[PDB]
Amino acid sequence: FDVGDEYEIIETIGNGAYGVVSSARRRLTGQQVAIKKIPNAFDVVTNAKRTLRELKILKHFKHDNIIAIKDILRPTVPYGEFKSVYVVLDLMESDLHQIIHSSQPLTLEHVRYFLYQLLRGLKYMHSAQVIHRDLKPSNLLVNENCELKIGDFGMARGLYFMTEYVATRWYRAPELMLSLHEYTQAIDLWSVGCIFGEMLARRQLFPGKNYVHQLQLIMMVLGTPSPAVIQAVGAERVRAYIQSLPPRQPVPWETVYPGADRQALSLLGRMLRFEPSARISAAAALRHPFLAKYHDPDDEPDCAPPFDFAFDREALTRERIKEAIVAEIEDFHARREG
Ligand SMILES: CCOc1cc(N2CCC(O)CC2)ccc1Nc1ncc2c(n1)N(C)c1ccccc1C(=O)N2C
């Protein structure tokens, strides 16, 4: 690490393919933060593009249920030697994966409040025309006061070919799996369904071992998909596999989750569907009786203007992307002078 005399590192808390997250605190004030070192940020084209996407998306959003950038450290060395980017972020106590899968409490009210906040965050996000495409419990961060923030926007796109490799298997929407040529904000609401069902039972809803077994377990609850959907499948082998299986009626959610709440299973049923148009939106989900306790439309804003993904469609070299990223770091600091 290399954060200067402004911050103070404590302990490493997270690590992925393109990020080393660590807790810290600012010395002038004392408040706790998360610093995320992106090492060798400009060495690979895909990694540089993800980095510039996250910076622009997180700079666009200002919402209590979306991770915010608190600061981006400027280059300490001259430009040519600037290899590692440091991003200062909201520090959060844990994530929902850890919360669900532990000896911690998770009563119905926990699920209701967590779900409300996720959906509150998605309403704002979706109004900006941004699909997250990778919502899972481990990307839903939770703080000491039970506030839930959505994080990791590197997979996020707006409104390609190999769609079945978008996201993680267990939370991947059918339309991506089967390539149904209708990819919208609806993708996220499938994932929210899986998250919701996971909180109710404290185990994964559709834990598939492989591509085919993922389709099995989904069809064991939802039943066999309709002929309209079946014909919409692009690959010959998948369509052939579904048609070989016998017809199956949908199992009621009241039987899938026996002891669970009646109003919860109602809203779950509106999320977990084969047809993406058949799924309830985030905005309509907030209007459901299950979330009546927390719902207030004056406290649930949209995002305006929407997010432009045109920058990501450009064919830029590693250096041009480094220039683009450095421009954002400059723009961030220039925006905080008024
Ligand atoms: C005070 C330490 O709190 C934590 C403990 C654990 N652990 C202890 C280790 C156990 O094995 C597992 C749970 C995990 C996370 C946090 N907090 C935290 N806050 C903020 C972020 C973050 N994590 N990372 C890693 C993210 C993860 C997913 C998506 C986004 C982020 C992100 O961008 N930020 C800034």
Author numbering: 49 to 207, 216 to 394
Pull verbatim passages from the article behind this deposition.
ERK5 is the effector kinase of a canonical kinase module comprising MEK (MAPK/ERK kinase) 5, MEKK (MEK kinase) 2/3 and ERK5 itself.
Compound 2 has a primary alcohol in place of the methylpiperazine group of compound 1, an N-methyl in place of the N-cyclopentyl substituent on the tricyclic ring system, and an O-ethyl in place of an O-methyl at the meta-position of the phenyl group. As observed for the complex of compound 1 with ERK5, compounds 2–5 bind to a ‘DFG-in’ conformation of ERK5 in which both the hydrophobic R-spine (residues Leu106, Ile117, His180 and Phe201 in ERK5) and C-spine (Val69, Ala82, Leu144, Leu188, Leu189, Val190, Ile251 and Met255) are intact. The kinase selectivity-profile data show that compound 5 is the most selective, while compound 3 is the most promiscuous, with the selectivity of compound 2 being intermediate.
